[PDB]
Curated annotation (Swiss-Prot):
Entry protein name: Ceramide transfer protein
Subcellular location: Cytoplasm; Golgi apparatus; Endoplasmic reticulum
Organism, scientific name: Homo sapiens
Reported impact of residue 136 to A: Reduces ceramide transfer
Region of the whole protein represented: 363 to 624 of 624
Record-annotated START domain positions: 9-224
Phylogenetic placement of the source organism: Eukaryota, Metazoa, Chordata, Craniata, Vertebrata
Tissue specificity statement from the Swiss-Prot or TrEMBL entry: Widely expressed.
Domain notes per entry: The START domain recognizes ceramides and diacylglycerol lipids, interacts with membranes, and mediates the intermembrane transfer of ceramides and diacylglycerol lipids. The PH domain targets the Golgi apparatus.
Binding site for an N-acylsphing-4-enine: 84, 105, 136, 185
Role, per record: Shelters ceramides and diacylglycerol lipids inside its START domain and mediates the intracellular trafficking of ceramides and diacylglycerol lipids in a non-vesicular manner.
Length: 230
């Protein structure tokens, strides 16, 4: 990367690789709040100044897809509405590089309160499984100032994927049967204003697992029977 946010991207990617990849399942500071299938959703309850900040971390394992494929579908704005259900509208404010964009988006009223908007850098990176990661983090832009309609949320999100391969023996080439993508998804969101704590927590518990199930299911469908993109 040659652009003005490279140092910040690289620090965010490094922070996620170092801290977000740790297993939280034995970590007593985290609570397992939703399990279904291979999916496990954890959170830490955190409030500051009355505002709910609970860090969220989920793990999943999805047969028959690669990390590259999952991060591609997570990042590529062209397919966003194929799977996303909380976003009202959104657009690319700036293209920084082939792999790095700045997105402005508005959300549907997921809890009863003002709509939030959010303005973030979205970058997709391969880290020498080689790990794929998409980092979405709030930035300011002169073309997207704050406004009176929406409360501005601040986000630090990551989708981190590793591909496990069990190639066959015999004269059999590798198929999607032989691959499994290990996912870690982190979301640290500042909702930007006050709301009833239990409401925000119940919305989180609903909307994150909903997203991960629908999204991974989507990637599975879109890649089924196609050549494997490692
Ligand atoms: C109004 C909601 C507060 C903002 C929280 C949004 C967190 C996701 C931000 C984001 O990175 O979106 C783009 C990214 C694709 O690259 O998609 C995602 O991370 C999908 C997450 C959607 C579920 C969020 C539920 C919010 C309930 C509190």
């Amino acid at each position: 990367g040659t652009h003005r946010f490279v140092q910040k991207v690289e620090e965010m990617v490094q922070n996620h690789m170092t801290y977000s990849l740790q297993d939280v399942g034995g970590d007593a500071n985290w609570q397992l709040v939703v399990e279904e299938g291979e999916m496990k959703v954890y959170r830490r309850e955190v409030e500051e100044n009355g505002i709910v900040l609970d860090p969220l971390k989920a793990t999943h394992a999805v047969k028959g897809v690669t990390g590259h494929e999952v991060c591609n579908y997570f990042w590529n704005v062209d397919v966003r509405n194929d799977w996303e259900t909380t976003i009202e509208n959104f657009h690319v404010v700036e293209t920084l590089a082939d792999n790095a964009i700045i997105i402005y988006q508005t959300h549907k009223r997921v809890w009863p309160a003002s709509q939030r908007d959010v303005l973030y850098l979205s970058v997709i990176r391969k880290i020498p499984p080689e790990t794929w990661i998409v980092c979405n983090f709030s930035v300011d832009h002169d073309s997207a100032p704050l406004n009176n309609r929406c409360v501005r949320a601040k986000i630090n999100v990551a989708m981190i994927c590793q591909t496990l391969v069990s190639p066959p023996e015999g004269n059999q080439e590798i198929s999607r049967d032989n691959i499994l993508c290990k996912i870690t998804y982190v979301a640290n969101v500042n909702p930007g204003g006050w709301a009833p704590a239990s409401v925000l927590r119940a919305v989180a518990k609903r909307e994150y697992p909903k997203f991960l199930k629908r999204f991974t299911s989507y990637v599975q469908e879109k890649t089924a029977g196609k050549p494997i993109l490692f």
